[PDB]
Amino acid sequence: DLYEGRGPDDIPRMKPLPKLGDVLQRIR
Amino acid sequence: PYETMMYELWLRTVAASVREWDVREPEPLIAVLEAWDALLPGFVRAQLLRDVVRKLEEAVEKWQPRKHTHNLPHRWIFPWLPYLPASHLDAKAATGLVADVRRKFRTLIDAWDFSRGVIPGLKHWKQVLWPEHGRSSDYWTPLMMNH
Amino acid sequence: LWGDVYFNPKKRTFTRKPIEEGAKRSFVNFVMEPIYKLYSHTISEGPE
Amino acid sequence: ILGTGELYMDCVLHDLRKLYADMEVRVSDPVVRFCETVQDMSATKCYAITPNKKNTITMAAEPLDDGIAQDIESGAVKIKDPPRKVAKFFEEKYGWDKLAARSIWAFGPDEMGPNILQDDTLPTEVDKKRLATVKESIRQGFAWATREGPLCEEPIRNTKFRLIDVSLFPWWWPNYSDRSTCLLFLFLDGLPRLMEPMYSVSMTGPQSSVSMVYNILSRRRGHVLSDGPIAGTPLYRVNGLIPVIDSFGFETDLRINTPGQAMVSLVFDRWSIVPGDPLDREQVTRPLQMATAQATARDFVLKTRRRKGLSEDVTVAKFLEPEFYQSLLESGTLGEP
Amino acid sequence: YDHQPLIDTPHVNGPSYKRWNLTLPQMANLYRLSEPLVSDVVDPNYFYLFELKSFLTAKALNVALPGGPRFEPLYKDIDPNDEDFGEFNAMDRIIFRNPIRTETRVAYPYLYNSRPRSVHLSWHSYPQIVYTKTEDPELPAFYFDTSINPISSRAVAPKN
């Protein structure tokens, strides 16, 4: 766990959260 | 997405709490880690453990073994002992919390007079730094017998 | 002009607290709003 | 060439190539200026005998307490201050004995240097006038020796010396390398450590930028001291700590990786202990390779020694008289060579 | 949609159509109509290491920036095998930290390159823009935005 935490490759690059209204529109 | 948001927000908050809190009372931080460890990702757990190990090593380096005996290093490092990393907890390591504790105990043994008594926390320090098996990896007996 | 002082207009007085709920500070009322209005009317209004 | 930072040395090397020397100059990879210290007090009271075997010097070394080096660098005390005021300051602030605080002789390497030399010697055993002449000799010999240091010939910080009894001083000494040598071996018996400079990191930017700062400092062996909003702006300011040798390229990496725009200031803050023990013969680092967390001090001191042209290892035999060297080898205080 | 708009009005110098002056409503309406083809970029810090001087430095250094162009080398003369074991190329002498990237080699070309010929010093930084475009159209010109960190009285706090 610590190796994947400290691994520069294994520490993932992040992206922002979704849109709930857009998800509801996609479902509809 | 939820994992990365939890990583950013929760790990930043936990690092802020670790920086703000006193090192000598790690029970509330350990309780927070135990409560939130179910949803904590591995990266956030590793970063929080790194911050805790940095705080403990800073306290061990800054505390005077001969003078500042009020805050016991053994009692301070007891709460984070099960969650500490192998590299920090390895007494044979050149750098680490265990290595700093062993060096401080050796320095106190070298510069300790018989009138002041025994070193507080040295029993638990030797219990932490004493390997169960292995003569070459036992850093407690040799440093004690040499200092 | 500086500080936590307020200009009550009809009394022409400078008081530590306003005479009306929402009255302006001395610095705001006499310095900071005129500069805002200078900028706003310079960039917003037509030539005439 | 020693300079403040990346932009500073970029400007300096531009002015070297294009402005002053007007030619092509080969430039190495950037590195840092190291320092040296001790973390344990000296176990063996080390002594040295002159080449003419007239004088003998016996002493020990100790780490200094926290704040003495910074106060002496700022100028809380001076070597030209009255000794009563100096003794009063040390006794009041650091809980020091009056005899020791009056017995503090030397600040090294310069007047505001971070090393101190004090005689714990007894006047009942040492005559003061011979002690005065050999004391001036020890003034300038200690000053000569404390610029170098034994590990990588880099100056040594945060050190106290105690000149112990029995050491007798007959007249006249023209050699300096002998008590330089016993200071160096005293450092080895004090089990020294290497010290690297630290930049305080301070960035300004948005919240995606502070997340990326935490990430990049985690890769580059720094940590975030403080993290807050700037009142009245949408900006956040993040202060932290990093080593200079790991901060090479840190600003560029942060600016090209953050999705917002982060602005970074790297200032020299302090000297901190590099991880690892410099004398651990076990720790081996492959060439072309990143040093591990435990072998870092060893790797730094070996490559500094090889860059300066020194020997591949610290030579206790060169740093000792043969008689005391063999005696300590028999006693087992020193390790296997 | 006139051929030479405003050519008979006082918004142009005359029929030779050489100098214009427009009002703020006209300029705002043209900006809104040109919305599909206007740059969103407000900060000049956006083009850090993605502008002309950086591209020219990378071209002179025979390196390619991420997303930037790539050219024929300026200097195909230096190989390390030509720079054989004289003094500096000792792997046993160089302390290796984490590696220095091409972007850093371009950002500081005189520190990170042994022969930085024909490289250009690019603009280092600009002050950060703290302007955010308002989405709600009922909001006034001057308002304390939710994106702005609030100012507290105890955040000001004259202590002594």
Side-chain angles (χ1 to χ4, degrees), chain A residues 5 7-8 12 16 18 21, chain B residues 1 15-16 26 28 31 35 38 41-42 46 59 65 73 79 82 85-86 91 93-94 96 99 111 117 120-121 131 134 142, chain C, chain D, chain E:
Chain C
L1 265 179
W2 192 245
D4 279 331
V5 310
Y6 292 78
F7 185 70
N8 308 347
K10 64 182 181 293
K11 275 86 59 184
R12 320 216 63 78
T13 45
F14 291 90
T15 63
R16 191 178 292 178
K17 297 296 289 183
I19 207 68
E20 304 174 355
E21 212 169 19
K24 300 174 176 176
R25 272 188 171 80
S26 69
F27 177 78
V28 172
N29 184 82
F30 276 100
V31 180
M32 188 66 204
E33 273 190 346
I35 297 177
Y36 263 76
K37 289 169 187 184
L38 186 75
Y39 273 64
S40 169
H41 289 268
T42 306
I43 67 173
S44 305
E45 285 180 349
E48 310 305 323
Chain D
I1 309 184
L2 277 300
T4 317
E6 284 178 321
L7 180 70
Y8 194 83
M9 299 289 297
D10 192 83
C11 293
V12 161
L13 288 173
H14 169 102
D15 284 355
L16 185 67
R17 281 140 153 158
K18 288 175 70 175
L19 184 55
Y20 297 134
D22 190 52
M23 66 182 180
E24 293 213 48
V25 166
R26 174 170 301 127
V27 173
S28 78
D29 266 331
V31 76
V32 303
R33 176 173 50 83
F34 288 116
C35 277
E36 293 179 354
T37 192
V38 298
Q39 91 192 17
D40 298 322
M41 61 79 71
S42 298
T44 68
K45 313 184 173 192
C46 293
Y47 78 102
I49 298 171
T50 52
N52 47 31
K53 307 186 182 188
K54 280 184 182 172
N55 317 318
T56 317
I57 291 191
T58 304
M59 65 182 179
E62 185 186 350
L64 274 170
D65 292 295
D66 301 335
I68 304 159
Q70 293 82 17
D71 291 331
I72 191 167
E73 268 185 338
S74 84
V77 297
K78 277 89 174 178
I79 205 61
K80 291 179 167 158
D81 287 332
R84 297 178 184 173
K85 201 179 180 203
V86 168
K88 177 187 172 188
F89 190 90
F90 288 118
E91 161 205 345
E92 274 186 332
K93 200 156 188 182
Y94 306 99
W96 274 36
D97 172 39
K98 285 185 178 173
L99 189 149
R102 289 171 187 187
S103 297
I104 290 171
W105 288 354
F107 292 160
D110 47 47
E111 304 181 352
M112 294 182 286
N115 318 117
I116 62 170
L117 180 75
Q118 169 209 316
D119 55 346
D120 193 74
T121 50
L122 292 184
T124 54
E125 302 185 359
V126 188
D127 185 74
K128 290 299 188 182
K129 308 169 185 176
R130 296 182 185 197
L131 192 52
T133 57
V134 186
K135 160 200 175 179
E136 178 54 50
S137 198
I138 282 169
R139 290 311 316 211
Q140 62 84 30
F142 156 75
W144 184 93
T146 187
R147 282 82 58 85
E148 296 296 325
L151 265 166
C152 56
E153 280 201 353
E154 281 290 321
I156 190 166
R157 294 177 64 88
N158 221 20
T159 311
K160 182 175 174 66
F161 289 118
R162 293 179 170 176
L163 294 174
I164 318 168
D165 285 311
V166 184
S167 60
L168 294 176
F169 318 108
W171 42 269
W172 291 3
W173 192 358
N175 293 355
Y176 319 106
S177 45
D178 176 357
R179 73 279 191 189
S180 304
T181 304
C182 65
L183 293 174
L184 302 189
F185 176 62
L186 183 63
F187 290 137
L188 272 73
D189 266 351
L191 305 178
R193 297 294 284 279
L194 200 76
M195 290 219 292
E196 68 200 324
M198 294 296 172
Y199 290 165
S200 64
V201 171
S202 172
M203 62 80 70
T204 308
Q207 280 173 350
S208 59
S209 298
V210 56
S211 303
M212 185 63 72
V213 169
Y214 270 92
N215 284 36
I216 298 179
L217 273 173
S218 76
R219 333 289 164 81
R220 275 173 177 263
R221 286 199 314 119
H223 44 268
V224 172
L225 269 56
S226 80
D227 180 4
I230 302 177
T233 74
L235 301 172
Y236 278 75
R237 174 171 174 172
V238 175
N239 315 270
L241 207 73
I242 201 176
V244 188
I245 198 159
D246 290 278
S247 69
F248 300 146
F250 169 70
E251 170 176 22
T252 310
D253 273 30
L254 182 49
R255 285 174 79 179
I256 63 170
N257 297 359
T258 182
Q261 316 304 320
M263 287 297 120
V264 180
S265 298
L266 298 193
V267 189
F268 171 73
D269 198 11
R270 51 173 159 261
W271 307 87
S272 291
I273 307 296
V274 63
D277 210 295
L279 298 173
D280 190 13
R281 198 58 53 101
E282 196 271 337
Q283 288 300 326
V284 184
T285 71
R286 306 188 185 184
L288 277 296
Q289 281 291 105
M290 187 66 203
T292 61
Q294 300 308 344
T296 304
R298 179 89 173 121
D299 180 11
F300 286 5
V301 65
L302 303 174
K303 291 183 164 156
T304 317
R305 277 180 77 80
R306 179 71 275 172
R307 266 193 86 264
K308 283 182 181 172
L310 316 175
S311 49
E312 207 269 339
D313 269 318
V314 191
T315 42
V316 194
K318 289 183 188 166
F319 286 154
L320 260 176
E321 290 265 349
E323 303 175 4
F324 189 52
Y325 178 59
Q326 285 178 354
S327 80
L328 282 199
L329 275 182
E330 289 170 9
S331 79
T333 56
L334 292 152
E336 288 184 343
Chain E
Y1 283 131
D2 287 6
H3 159 56
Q4 280 160 312
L6 297 173
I7 203 163
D8 291 331
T9 82
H11 292 291
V12 308
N13 63 298
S16 87
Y17 208 59
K18 281 200 182 167
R19 290 178 317 276
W20 54 274
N21 53 272
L22 285 170
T23 66
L24 158 72
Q26 279 159 343
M27 284 305 297
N29 189 179
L30 296 157
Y31 185 61
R32 181 204 328 138
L33 279 164
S34 59
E35 204 260 331
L37 310 179
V38 292
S39 175
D40 316 301
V41 168
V42 178
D43 213 338
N45 281 312
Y46 175 90
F47 309 92
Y48 178 62
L49 302 179
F50 206 76
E51 54 90 26
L52 172 63
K53 300 292 202 77
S54 315
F55 292 143
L56 291 177
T57 295
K59 177 179 181 286
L61 291 180
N62 193 25
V63 289
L65 290 170
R70 180 66 178 87
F71 302 84
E72 293 317 281
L74 195 51
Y75 297 107
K76 31 173 181 196
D77 62 358
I78 284 293
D79 204 44
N81 313 268
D82 303 323
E83 198 261 326
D84 190 73
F85 289 121
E87 172 74 23
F88 273 5
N89 56 1
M91 49 180 209
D92 80 354
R93 285 178 65 201
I94 301 299
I95 297 91
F96 282 61
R97 307 315 288 147
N98 62 186
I100 297 89
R101 322 191 68 216
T102 289
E103 299 91 318
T104 314
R105 298 265 191 251
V106 172
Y108 300 98
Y110 293 95
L111 171 63
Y112 287 114
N113 303 101
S114 283
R115 318 189 69 184
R117 295 158 288 187
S118 297
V119 297
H120 298 261
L121 288 190
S122 67
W123 200 274
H124 172 264
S125 44
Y126 302 83
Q128 288 159 302
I129 292 307
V130 295
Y131 162 81
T132 81
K133 204 190 253 203
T134 300
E135 300 292 337
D136 171 339
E138 303 288 320
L139 278 192
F142 311 123
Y143 70 84
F144 209 102
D145 195 15
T146 58
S147 312
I148 297 180
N149 299 130
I151 297 169
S152 164
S153 64
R154 275 70 174 174
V156 178
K159 184 64 173 62
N160 286 111

